[PDB]
Amino acid sequence: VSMTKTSVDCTMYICGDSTECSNLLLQYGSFCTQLNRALTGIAVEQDK
Amino acid sequence: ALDPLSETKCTLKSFTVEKGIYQTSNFRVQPTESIVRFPNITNLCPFGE
Which residues of A touch B11 (CB under 8 A)? Predict the structure, then answer.
C-alpha cells in the first residue's frame, strides 16, 4: 500500500558542497526543480 | 529571502500561496573554518647541515 517516501535533493546530489558546480547546474534550468516535484508528488500520493 | 512565506512564492513562481505544506528549499550548514592536519615535519633531508 505505502511505498518508502524518498525526497532526493538535486542541489546536493549533483554538486556536492560546490557553488561553482551549482552555477553549472543552473544552466540546465528547472531540471532540478522538476525532479524534486516528481519525488514530492510520490511522497504525497503514498500518504494519500 | 525576506520571509519564509516569500520563499513559497519564489519556489512556486506564483504570487498566491494556496493552503498546504510546500518545500521551498533545502537548508545546508556551511563549514565554519578550514581544518588542516598534516604528518610530522620530521624525517627531512638535512639541507641546513
Answer: 33
A25: three-class secondary structure by DSSP: helix
Answer whether B23 sits within 8 Å of A11, measured CB to CB: no
In chain B, what residues touch A12 (CB-CB under 8 Å)? 26, 28
Q: How many CA atoms lie within 13 A of A17 on its CB side?
A: 3
Q: Compute CA B32 distance to the chain's CA centroid, rounded to the nearest angstrom.
A: 10
Write the secondary structure of chain B as one string of H (helix), E (strand) and C (coil): CCCHHHHHHHHHCCCCCCCCCCCCCCCCCCCCCCCCCCCCCCCCCCCCC
Q: Contact A12/B26, CB-based, under 8 Å?
A: yes
| Cα separation, B3 vs A19, whole angstroms | 23
Which cell numbers hold the place of B16? 498566491
